[PDB]
Amino acid sequence: LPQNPNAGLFKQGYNSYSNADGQIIKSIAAIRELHQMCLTSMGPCGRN
Amino acid sequence: LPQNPNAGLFKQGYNSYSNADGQIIKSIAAIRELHQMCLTSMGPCGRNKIIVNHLGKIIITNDAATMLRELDIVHPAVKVLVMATEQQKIDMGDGTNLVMILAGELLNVSEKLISMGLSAVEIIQGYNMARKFTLKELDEMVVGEITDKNDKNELLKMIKPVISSKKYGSEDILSELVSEAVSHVLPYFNVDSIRVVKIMGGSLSNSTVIKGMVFNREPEGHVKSLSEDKKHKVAVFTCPLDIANTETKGTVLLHNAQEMLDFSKGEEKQIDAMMKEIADMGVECIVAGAGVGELALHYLNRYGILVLKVPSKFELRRLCRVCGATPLPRLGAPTPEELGLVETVKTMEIGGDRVTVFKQEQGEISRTSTIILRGATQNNLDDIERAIDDGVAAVKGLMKPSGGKLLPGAGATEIELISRITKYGERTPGLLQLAIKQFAVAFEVVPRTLAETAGLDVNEVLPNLYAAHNVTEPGAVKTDHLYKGVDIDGESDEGVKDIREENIYDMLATKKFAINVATEAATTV
Amino acid sequence: VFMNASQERTTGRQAQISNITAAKAVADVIRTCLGPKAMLKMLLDPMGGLVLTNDGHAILREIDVAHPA
Amino acid sequence: MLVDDIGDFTVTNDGATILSLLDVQHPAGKILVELAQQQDREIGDGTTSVV
Amino acid sequence: SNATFKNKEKPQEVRKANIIAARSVADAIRTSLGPKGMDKMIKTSRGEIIISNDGHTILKQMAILHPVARMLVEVSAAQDSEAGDGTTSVVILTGALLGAAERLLNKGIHPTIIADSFQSAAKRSVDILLEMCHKVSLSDREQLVRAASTSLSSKIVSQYSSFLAPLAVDSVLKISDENSKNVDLNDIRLVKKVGGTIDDTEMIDGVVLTQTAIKSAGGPTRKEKAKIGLIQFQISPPKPDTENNIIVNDYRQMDKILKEERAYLLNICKKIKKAKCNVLLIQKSILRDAVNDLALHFLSKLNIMVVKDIEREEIEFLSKGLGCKPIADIELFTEDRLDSADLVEEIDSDGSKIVRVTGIRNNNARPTVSVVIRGANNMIIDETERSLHDALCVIRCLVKERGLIAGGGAPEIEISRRLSKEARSMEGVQAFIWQEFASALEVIPTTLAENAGLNSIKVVTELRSKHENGELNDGISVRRSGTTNTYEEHILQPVLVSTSAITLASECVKSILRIDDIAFSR
Amino acid sequence: AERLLNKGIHPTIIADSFQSAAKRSVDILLEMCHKVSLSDREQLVRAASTSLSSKIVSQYSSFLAPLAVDSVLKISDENSKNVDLNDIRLVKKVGGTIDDTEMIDG
Amino acid sequence: GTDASQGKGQIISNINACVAVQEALKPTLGPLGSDILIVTSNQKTTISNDGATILKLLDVVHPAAKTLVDISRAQDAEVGDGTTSVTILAGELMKEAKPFLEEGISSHLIMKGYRKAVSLAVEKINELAVDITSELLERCARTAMSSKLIHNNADFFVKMCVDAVLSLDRNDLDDKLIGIKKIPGGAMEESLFINGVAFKKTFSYAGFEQQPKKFNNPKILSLNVELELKAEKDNAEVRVEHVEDYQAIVDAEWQLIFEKLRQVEETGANIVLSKLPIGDLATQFFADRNIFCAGRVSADDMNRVIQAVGGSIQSTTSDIKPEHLGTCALFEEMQIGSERYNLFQGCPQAKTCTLLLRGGAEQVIAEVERSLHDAIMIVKRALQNKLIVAGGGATEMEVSKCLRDYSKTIAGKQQMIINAFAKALEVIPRQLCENAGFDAIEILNKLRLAHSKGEKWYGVVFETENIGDNFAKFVWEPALVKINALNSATEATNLILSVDETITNKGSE
Ligand SMILES: Nc1ncnc2c1ncn2[C@@H]1O[C@@H](COP(=O)(O)OP(=O)(O)O)[C@@H](O)[C@H]1O
Ligand SMILES: Nc1ncnc2c1ncn2[C@@H]1O[C@@H](COP(=O)(O)OP(=O)(O)O)[C@H](O)[C@H]1O
Ligand SMILES: Nc1ncnc2c1ncn2[C@@H]1O[C@@H](COP(=O)(O)OP(=O)(O)O)[C@H](O)[C@H]1O
Ligand SMILES: Nc1ncnc2c1ncn2[C@@H]1O[C@H](COP(=O)(O)OP(=O)(O)O)[C@H](O)[C@H]1O
Ligand code: BEF
Ligand code: BEF
Ligand code: BEF
Ligand code: BEF
């Protein structure tokens, strides 16, 4: 028994699209990942 | 690197589409495959092809409706013309080949018409309007005196061609047994009653027909059975011969010694009581049809009474219709108005097999008879019963008025029709002319197919027949056993009319379905 | 597409000759046993058949031939 | 929050119930889990702390 | 955002997936949307061949798993179970409905706008419809056969279509009574026989059974004037509903106890023999030919044609035709609740015996009918029976409601024209797309010409060229490339359908316009 | 082309409809153009700032627009005539921002 | 066995997982919230906007995400209309409350800070209150109808719903006594609303077709008994020592069967509804009493007919009473075409209300009742609690400008909490504008000014241009809803905010 949603517009192999607003929320966080790691590094009384 | 064409419109799993014109070219050939295999099968001077069941059993036939019966096809189109032959062999005995032969050819010739420019709808109406003209024209093309049915005179004349078709060379002797087993049924008549029993040993020519059915079984009661009588009166009944067993819950309970010491005796009493009661009635033979009790079998052997073991529920009937008696549930309470007289119930053995019989009648004469076929090959003896059942079906049609109308077979009619069908389309305006002139030449099968069988130069046989429209009957045909073209009238060879009509219809019906379909959506697995 | 895949067919002189010359096989084996200078055969079917009967039937039963002809 | 390795969750601050959902591999650890569930019997609270 | 392992669907792409899918079902179905349609062969897994032209058939035989497509079917399916016809013509309407709705939508128009445009035109198109129908009297042979030969055609049996058309109406008519009123297409038995061709079928003013009566010494072949007893008790030795042990005290008691059962046979056979009711029809199974009962044969020893294992649904179809109260049990039996039939012939083929109650009833007006659907091959008695379901029900939608619509796409051409003409009625940029629904409705007419061969644009144009003042009824003739009207060809199509179909199409595609995501799962 | 084609119109019909309109549309085109003099700073920068925009550097589009035209102009000579965009070297440096680029007369 | 993420490094993965679910509901809001075709297993396939069913048939891996999708049905049962909104609020409630976690001292200062929020907000949510007459409910029941595919016939349903509610008819109406058949076909305007019970029950009396098609003034007997030769409950076995005690036993069978209906016809019955089928014998002995009999009726069904008819279901006919038979007007088994169906209506002061619908495919119909329920229920919410709130997101913007006021008026380091709760409630109307934009943002500040000195009401229209005024517009959401939707939205976040570690295995040990 079914079912299965077809694919709207095909392409080669595999490619990754990203809706802009969604990407901004999503990529603004990726960015945010390396932030909390660079925060503690800056300044004298910090960490390495 | 690329590339790859996507899929225009998807669906579930896998499915197979078929453009209609392409399918017609493609499926008209599938059909054509089983054609060249059915061509060589039809007619006497032909051939028979072996087939090995999916279970391993071996089968040899001339009949094309059986070839397919043992054949597992896949082609939904071919499936049709196979359903045809099969959907005929049941309704009408013979004519199963003229089905495929025409059907296939109709499709074959229609191709030309489909390629020329015609359309399937145009092709259908074309052929159809011919089926109505070919069916009627034949209703009068007969000229074969509808002989009245009596004795073996008219029977042997008709029953032979029905047989000489596949089992050629034994036509005479064969049909003899057929007509024989027939005239033992006092004339509405049932075809089913004439059963057949073949047993290995000797050549087929040593077969015989006895008034009454044969049982490949020994008389129960051990060495206490007679197995030999003279003009004994029989009495057949279903209910178990043993004690009256509880159909529902039932056992045997005893409380005191007197009970036990007597319960063993009580049985013996009832037993003898039941038996002697039926024995005094003059019953010389009890044909048990269901269940046999050794407890009470003690009685029956001593007086001098036979006992035929319990056959199949369906075989008791055809048996009873021989004896004259009548079956009756419950043991005892015999009724002389339900008793039947049997001539002889001896125990003869053919091929070294213990067998009981009902052969010959002084006598009351059985209403059903069986043919005893001696042979040397399990396969042949089987494709002899077939050539028989065909006959038994030919006598089934002649027995229902007014189908007893003869007709110039042996190609004769199937050749005259060529022209007669041509004229119709020769004088019918429109595009349907072509679709008719085709349906006509379609009947080129039966003619050529006979010639090509004997090694006869087909390029001569056809022209000869065309010249010989003689209209004497005709009056014109082809016998593989002569020179040039033979004469149907002479050989006394004529194919029953109604069978041809059924064949000419079922083919024009099936061939139309195959033509009618445009797209075939086949599934998987 | 018919025919079904797969089931062997010999159309032509094939079966016409590869059935006679194939029947000849079993008919070539027994063709030694007969008469005063007889040639009795022995054969072990599945399991220890170990049966030696010169009865042409008894012999042709053990060959258990599979060929139609 | 403890995951029933089948998606199912369970949020809790209780120390006793939390240690039970851990599985307590080893004698020394399970010994504390055992000491935990003892505390509820004595009291009912502090299981988180006694350990 | 997504717990993974799932199949969401981008907004703008969704509509494509929806439309492109939905629009495509019609691509396969349009080959049957017309009397000049194309017949298909459906080879199933097992190998069983079904020949049909019926959209629904195809839709139920073929494997459909589509999220969009699978829905389009669940509507025409519900449309057949209710309306009873116009199966395919519904999938099509959704096709061109989205086809046209997408066009304007692909260029800016909001989905929710056309989504209003839908119901907007829906109502107003249901208006013209209720104004396009024709009042029809009751009980008119020619006026009904005119509707039968309209549906019972477009079938494989085109040569013989006027052969089933009569057999179709005659039976229905024999069912419709005025209680009041109420037809019961379920109360007209249809048993298929295997003989002759698809033709050679015989409409029967009565009931034809599959039951049999196998008695060599008994089993009467015919009944000139046989009374009928509608009963339903076991023709066999039953057993207590509690644990059962019958114990024989003595060895003799054995024979003596074997009568304690036969007593439970004659117990009812007696009350039945006294009534001397002749032919009997026990709903209880014997079944067919094989015992039980042995004593059952004794019941026919008194020369009493009786067949058991009757169909439950055909027992009610018996009381009305027979006109005899089917006594469930015999405790309060009588002799009044019997019936009669001029003839009963249990003709048997090969080993199968079909009991026919020919010339039966005549009394009580013979309310239940039965058409014999003869035919050699199976694939034939497959479509033929599939056509009557769409044939009887068809003509019974006129008798059901006193409304009929001119065929050849009358409201189809008309509704679009009304929509195309005056659009002021409603306002807003919404109605601006009621033109979509408009041009949409022309979906049936177009393909109709297409299925014939004659250019779909020229023919439909030849209708956009006929104007005047008066009855003004026009339609396309699939026959010639011309435009012969339906008002004269007697080729019409029921309202119960057009209304309950034009509401179905625009009730799905409107949901489709609405949807943003069609998230899937595993 | 599919819309009308999906409803009956032949592919070869619209296939003609194509070239049909093609020619006539090439006509209006040759009639929609404007005669323009030669060597006009403002009239060229008006075309540069039209293409050299719609770029990521929208804030700075009027920054590349000049650098775009000035160079080209310095290439176009009247032999006769012939420009050679291949004969204006473009070497990318890694410093500052996308801006801070300098048109070079050399 | 397995690892675990703890601390802020995980505290986050809890929050952004929350926002995640709400992201899939933004489209659904009343205005132009587009239907979502969700394919599910086994082969289920639904389509609509009803949160607690669009999320229900949508599985989620994460813990937090699994807590949110729970509030959906956690809310739908309580009021049954705040489906789409509660999720959209619960989520956004953390997004604008997150940067106060790290920058904020602790996750617990925010907890207390949320109580002073929900308390005050529920207050402001009570200020905008309206009174329900208890005809005019048709005004509010219109709103539940409006979002889903009921707008096309907003009128037809509002009545079909407040009517079904009207029949029962108790201080508390249990929609368990309000069956909802859903026939396919016809027209959506063809969805009558019987005052009895509709049954797929075909021509009753399976013996023969003799039983009356329908009866005027039927006196019904609804039974849970079997009405067939009873078997010894105590495992008994028979011993036929006699010779003809077999026939006598066979008789004892048909006997008890007659004695069965004998004492059941004594109640002058002319129609009986037995939960269980009836033996052919007992099917005839009563049939001669011209009484109808329908068997196989569902357990729940025979309770709807228990209030409609009026007769009490009784077992063991021997102790039958006159108070067991009922009074209903008629029983006509009209065919739905190809399929039968026995209808039974009438009877004064009857609670049961079966509202059969019509329209399109079984799926279309589904989404109809799906939203119909949202209506039927929305009226009980307003009926059990007769007071309403200023809808259109106005109520939301109100508690937002009110809390916002409390913001500055707070002296503490936990000020940044109440603030968050406020800012998040403004987002409730946000999408109302974003679903009909562009653009939502400009209209925001418009309401802030109006609320300040523009009186409580006045929100965003869903027409929609932008700003409007709901009392004038006519969109009033029963306070009961908005009340709990906010409460459900805040508390769940609080439990989730209380979490700082996630273990990835269970004993359960
Ligand atoms: N002398 C003959 N006797 C019988 N049949 C003959 C004779 N000569 C030719 N035939 C052929 O045998 C018949 C047909 O062969 P048959 O295998 O029976 O086809 P089918 O049974 O399908 O009709 C004749 O109609 C004819 O073509
Ligand atoms: N005295 C004999 N001299 C030569 N051959 C003989 C003699 N007696 C018998 N035979 C041959 O042996 C017999 C044939 O038997 P055969 O079928 O070959 O095997 P088996 O004897 O086992 O059945 C015949 O009688 C004959 O051909
Ligand atoms: N004689 C006709 N000429 C043109 N169109 C017809 C004609 N008869 C019927 N139609 C149209 O086609 C039918 C609908 O779908 P179809 O598959 O062709 O047959 P049906 O739905 O009755 O089984 C309608 O009756 C009508 O809209
Ligand atoms: N046209 C509207 N504009 C603003 N708010 C509305 C409008 N219609 C309804 N609402 C309110 O917003 C609410 C929250 O949405 P909900 O009913 O839970 O799911 P949905 O709005 O998608 O049906 C209600 O629908 C209602 O009380
Ligand atoms: F070929 Be026929 F059928 F003998
Ligand atoms: F968790 Be507490 F300590 F009980
Ligand atoms: F073919 Be119709 F639409 F039933
Ligand atoms: F989702 Be809404 F309440 F219909």
mmCIF file of N, CA and C and ligand atoms in Angstrom, chain D residues 14-15 44-48, ligand 6:
data_model
loop_
_atom_site.group_PDB
_atom_site.id
_atom_site.type_symbol
_atom_site.label_atom_id
_atom_site.label_comp_id
_atom_site.label_asym_id
_atom_site.label_seq_id
_atom_site.Cartn_x
_atom_site.Cartn_y
_atom_site.Cartn_z
ATOM 1 N N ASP D 14 13.710 14.772 40.859
ATOM 2 C CA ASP D 14 13.893 13.823 41.935
ATOM 3 C C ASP D 14 15.181 13.068 41.678
ATOM 4 N N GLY D 15 15.963 12.892 42.731
ATOM 5 C CA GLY D 15 17.207 12.149 42.636
ATOM 6 C C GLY D 15 17.006 10.650 42.632
ATOM 7 N N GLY D 44 11.415 10.302 52.559
ATOM 8 C CA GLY D 44 10.703 10.544 51.319
ATOM 9 C C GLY D 44 11.409 11.604 50.496
ATOM 10 N N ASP D 45 12.185 12.446 51.175
ATOM 11 C CA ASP D 45 12.930 13.521 50.526
ATOM 12 C C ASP D 45 14.412 13.420 50.867
ATOM 13 N N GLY D 46 15.248 14.057 50.053
ATOM 14 C CA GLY D 46 16.674 14.091 50.309
ATOM 15 C C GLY D 46 17.446 13.006 49.586
ATOM 16 N N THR D 47 16.733 12.146 48.866
ATOM 17 C CA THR D 47 17.372 11.093 48.083
ATOM 18 C C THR D 47 18.456 11.690 47.195
ATOM 19 N N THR D 48 18.167 12.870 46.656
ATOM 20 C CA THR D 48 19.101 13.579 45.798
ATOM 21 C C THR D 48 20.392 13.902 46.545
HETATM 22 F F1 BEF H 6 14.087 14.957 45.523
HETATM 23 BE BE1 BEF H 6 13.850 15.248 46.832
HETATM 24 F F2 BEF H 6 15.038 15.257 47.510
HETATM 25 F F3 BEF H 6 13.025 14.304 47.369
#
